Design a protein around this ligand. Sequence first.
Ligand code: COA
Ligand code: COA
Lengths: 252, 252
Amino acid sequence: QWALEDFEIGRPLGKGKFGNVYLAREKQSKFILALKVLFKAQLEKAGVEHQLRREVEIQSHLRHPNILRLYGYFHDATRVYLILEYAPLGTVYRELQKLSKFDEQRTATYITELANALSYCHSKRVIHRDIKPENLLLGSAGELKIADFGWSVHGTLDYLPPEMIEGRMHDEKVDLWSLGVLCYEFLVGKPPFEANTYQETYKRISRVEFTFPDFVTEGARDLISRLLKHNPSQRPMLREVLEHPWITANSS
Amino acid sequence: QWALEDFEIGRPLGKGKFGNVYLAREKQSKFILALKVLFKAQLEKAGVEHQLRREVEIQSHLRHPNILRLYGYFHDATRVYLILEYAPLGTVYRELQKLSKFDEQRTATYITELANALSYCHSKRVIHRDIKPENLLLGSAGELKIADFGWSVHGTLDYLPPEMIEGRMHDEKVDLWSLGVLCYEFLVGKPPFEANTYQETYKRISRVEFTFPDFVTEGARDLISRLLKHNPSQRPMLREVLEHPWITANSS
Ligand SMILES: CC(C)(COP(=O)(O)OP(=O)(O)OC[C@H]1O[C@@H](n2cnc3c(N)ncnc32)[C@H](O)[C@@H]1OP(=O)(O)O)[C@@H](O)C(=O)NCCC(=O)NCCS
Ligand SMILES: CC(C)(COP(=O)(O)OP(=O)(O)OC[C@H]1O[C@@H](n2cnc3c(N)ncnc32)[C@H](O)[C@@H]1OP(=O)(O)O)[C@@H](O)C(=O)NCCC(=O)NCCS
């Protein structure tokens, strides 16, 4: 049974949606890790405590170098504590601010690491949703780590149509749209559908209206255009992304 | 402002999911109507009180001879009262039990009345969901009346795919599957995908596995087969159903 008594609390790593994250050290092993404190008060009033518990159980069994490791968890009267792998190099979003934009090697290596973790979860019947640069942390070796909870595992009837008893929404096909948006932003520095207002961004996502700057090579354009399909079923498989010539030629 | 003081309560018409329905008479007009009493205690604990209020506002503006008229509504400390049009001839489900099965004239006339009410709501940006025989009441002239509440009116974004910002589920295309299931049950006496167990019914809906008894004519088979498409976008429009040769030849 884990307890707050087992950890030495250090500097705060930052503040999240429902609490704070601290650098910590397990007292017996002297092992450095991150302790994410989530207040049940604002978790229950946001209506996400049930959603969170499901996402924590799924992540507790995921072991992949490109997925932030959840070692364990515990709780008290008002808080829930998550024992997490500490990522020392920060977020990809901030690294993209430091470098303005990534080159083709770093971009293809990031896509390779993302596609490996997603294909690992695909084999483990785990599906991931939308992926942001802010939810991507970097380990000590420069490898990225998916660091969010967006994981999922998946009489009257006589009158229901198939679109209400089947499936249905949504399969492991949104992560492929995310690979297209991320790969674009990594190479360019901006998301492909960013606009001056809300409805203009909404329209350009609905019609898939994006263009490439003149410094984006044909291999990157080919990968981004195949990932960014309005039809989810026509987006590649995760194996095709890992075997794409631009990826196999530029990935580390 | 309506109040329970304005009505004389008579015999109970039946018991619903969240209350009871009574025959009533407005004291000033001596007008016979039905008073549906819904207990807020079991409405709030079932998590449907918010859903119900939205469905009641939509129905309060629907005026169609084949839609059960909602005259008004009021509430007190623990109950919500719905002033409804009284249907004297009961449900189509019970009439189907009395007649075992309907002929082609009654079936086509029922489909015509259902399609008119749905096309009326389609023009009023109102969409209806699954339709059961138990939710279809009969007026004094033998016309059916839809008598349920299944009515509806319809920064991070940079990383969301179109299948999450668009639409999406589900359009006014489930009512067309309902017309196929109802038209079949009216002519046959049983829903087309009824089976001995749950998963067998689930499978035959998923694969659209249904057959016609030898007494079902080709015109009815043509209408049912076009309504019962696994692809919603390939189901007819409500105007095609009203113009179908089997409908136009048998409807009253
Ligand atoms: C998105 C947001 C609400 C937080 O959401 P969240 O899902 O709760 O994020 P988390 O709780 O998982 O992590 C919060 C912090 O702890 C850090 N962290 C979490 N786990 C970590 C770990 N194992 N190792 C190292 N750092 C970690 C994160 O990097 C983050 O730091 P940051 O805020 O400096 O980037 C917050 O980032 C925000 O509002 N930022 C400002 C908005 C803005 O200015 N621009 C973006 C438009 S929305
Ligand atoms: C579906 C069920 C739970 C009720 O759900 P509901 O949406 O709350 O139904 P309602 O509150 O709108 O109406 C309830 C009664 O009032 C009647 N009623 C409602 N409004 C009326 C009106 N304006 N005029 C006349 N009668 C009316 C209905 O006909 C119904 O009568 P019934 O139960 O004898 O058929 C209930 O019908 C049931 O459980 N039946 C038994 C199940 C069964 O044996 N077979 C079906 C498999 S589920």
